[PDB]
Each structure stands twice: as C-alpha cells, then as structure tokens.
Amino acid sequence: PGDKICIGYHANNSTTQVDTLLEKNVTVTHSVELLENQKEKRFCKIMNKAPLDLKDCTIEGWILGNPKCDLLLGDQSWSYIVERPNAQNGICYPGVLNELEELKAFIGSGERVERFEMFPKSTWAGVDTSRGVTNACPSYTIDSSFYRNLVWIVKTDSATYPVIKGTYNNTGTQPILYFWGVHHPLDTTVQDNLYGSGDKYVRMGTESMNFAKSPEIAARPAVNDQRSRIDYYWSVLRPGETLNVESNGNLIAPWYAYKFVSTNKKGAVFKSDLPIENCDATCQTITGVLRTNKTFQNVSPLWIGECPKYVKSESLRLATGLRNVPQIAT
C-alpha cells in the first residue's frame, strides 16, 4: 500500500443551521446567536433604585393626593414608574387635568419628589378653609374628603367671598411642581351658595408665567354623582421664581406641593401589570428584564437602562465555523 497525505476540514455533530444570501438551512460546525428572545417577566431595581409602584392609583391620583392614595403620600424616590392598567383611584372629583400628557412626560423625567406645605390654609383670609370635602372623593375611612394637595375654598357665612392673595417665593435651588384648580358649578344656585355673587376669577403669575380663568357654569353629565366639574392645572416654579395667587372665588388652592429633582437617567413610566420584586437589573423592558450579553433583542423597544438593540427578527445567527459535512455512518 502507498503512503497517503490528504487535505481536508473539520466536521462535527452540530445540527445548528444558518442562512446565507445563496442558501438556506446550511448546517455549520460553529455559530453565534446574536439575538436574545428571553426575559424575566417582572420589574427589578435599576441603579439599585426601586421603581415606584402606584398600585391602585393612577399618576393623577398620586400627585394630586387622592385621599385613597395615602400609601404613596409624601416623599418618593424612584428609578422608574409602574402604573397598573386598571388602577381605580385617579381624578375623583370629575374634570380635566389640563396638559396631562405633558405632565406625565415631566414626571417621568424626575427621579425624586419632596412633599411640603406650599400655602398654609391661613394664607387665605376671610374664607372658609374647612368645608371643602365631597362624597366624590372619599378616603378609605371618611366618606367625604378631598385631595391632600389642594384646598377647596368656600365663602364663609358672610355674603362676601373676599379677594384673597397668596405668595410663595422659591428660594430653594429646586423646581417646585404644584397644582391648583378652578371649580365650575352645575348651576347659578350652587355658584351663589359656595361663592360670592358676581363675576369671579382666578389669576396667577410668576416672573415667566400668567394664568387667568373664570368659572364656566353649566350642568354636565353626572360622574361620581357630580354634574359640576373642576379644571385642574399644574406648573413648575423655577428656582428663584415667585408665585402670586389672587382669587375672587372658585379657587381650588394649592396646599401641598413637591420639590422636584430631575434625573440623568431616561426615565420611564411603564403601564403594566407585571410584579415588582426585590431584584436587580441592568436592562429593564416594559415586558421584562433582559439578562444577556447578546447584541440584539426581540422582547421590546421600550426600556430603561442598557439594553440590546430591538429588532423584529426571530434569530440572528452568524456562522463562524464552516459547512458541517460529517461522514455518514450506518
């Protein structure tokens, strides 16, 4: 028999396939999957910061201080916000929170708020602070209450609701996020009973801002057994800025407000029913945690943290070895 030398290549037991422009389903000896399709179906901490669980409250219910939202009442620090799709506690006294979307965007930008009394009830003189509660807004204990951050001001027994004024000067280095309202009664009779007779107004100003509104009296379809409405409003009092409040009547006054810190993170507001657990993540998507070193992911385009690039692909397997052509054994 003659001595032989042969030139050839590696084969192995790989059954893993790739596609090329010229050919589909090519089995190759070595390959790398570049795409991640696995997730943990939960929310974890990012930057070791817990997310804020709004529970049975919406974002509106939370920062207006819906009485049923007292669990969240106060001081809050977060890496992102989780809002449950069927949270029941939002705007309890019917009406519009004006520029809502842009409020939700601003809140998302923040990383922490500190609640504080902005205008003490004493600020308003000659008017009744105490009577402003409604059955539309119960707490979990009292059937007639009102948002923690607002005072519904009423005229006192005297016929007159006087001009009231309030000033807050922001000396603090942090912007303040604050709210107020204007109350629209269903009828002239309720308007007379609650507030003075005659033309009413709510006027507010800062160095950079103006606001004027008067009541728009009409009967509206009942919501929470109410045919009257409140126009809710929000604003941000910059560091160094001063707020002037002046009202003839129909004012839902700012009471408590929030010192606001913006963040260097994204941040996010995830509307989801997934559980929050005591875990850590590098990449949190709205449908779950990715815990991966892959380049691409097909889980979700919406995330916070460092995630792989989102694509619609099912798989992105790069060949690294060669065509696998093992010997046929019988």
Partner: protein, 173 residues
Amino acid sequence: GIFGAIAGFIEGGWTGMIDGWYGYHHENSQGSGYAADRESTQKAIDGITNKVNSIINKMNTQFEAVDHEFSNLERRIGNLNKRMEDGFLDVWTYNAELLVLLENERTLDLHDANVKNLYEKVKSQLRDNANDLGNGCFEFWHKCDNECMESVKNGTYDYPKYQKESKLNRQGI
C-alpha cells in the same frame, strides 16, 4: 462552494480532526492520523473573531422608543411618533438581517478558500513525486515517513531528496 473545495472536490469533513478547522490526514507504515494546520486555522479564528467583534461594535447603538401619551387632539403627532419609531425599527431589522445573510455567505467562502489554498500549497510542493488520488488526497511515489509527512505540513518538503526514488516507481507502474 465558491472556491470549490468544501463540499466540492473534497467531498466531506473529518469528525476525527478535532484540534483545528483545516488539516491533514496521513497514512504511512508508521501509522495514520489527523492533524490540524495550526497556522491557517489560527489566522481564520483571528479573522472571524474580528468580524464578529466588528459587527457587534457597529451594532452597539440603540434607537429609543418612548412611553409618551397623546390626547384626542394629537392624532397627527401620535401617528408621527409611531411612524418614526417603526421606521427606525424597520431600518435596523433590515440592516441586521441582510448583514447576517451576507456575512454568512462570505464566511463560508473564506473557509472554502483556506482549504483550497492549503490543498494547492501541498500540491505545489509534491509535484510529480506524488499522485493525485482525488478527494484532496495524494499518494506518494516514494516512502514518506513521519518526518517526511511533517515536512509537507511544515512547508519544508524536499522534492530533490525523493525525486530519483519516485521517478523509478512511476516507471515500474
């Protein structure tokens, strides 16, 4: 395949060659075995690794979609956001999927080339001191012991040293 070696004039691979991508199989009076060509395999490993890391690095940005709400008077800008995000999703899905199909074609060709060049390299050393048996195999016209085999693999094969012997046997047949 494009260089025609893999799944080509060399019909199958070797499960027995476990230390490299590209290699030699030899048989002689001393024995038989498989041995990877270390130099060509290691260069292919470096190259393919660089390719993978390049693709990963160029793919290391992420378009970012956002949670923003839109009101019932914001149909146009809401659709604008949607068409924008989907637009970049479609561009990046296309980029990644086409790149993988393309690079997979070219990586298989690169391997095909390294096998063919290894074959040609041996072929040009052996000249007519060996006979082509087909399937990338040569039968020597002379005794080729382990040191002879190694010299083929090393690129230091001595055609003059064996030319008389191989010429005599070529005649005898």
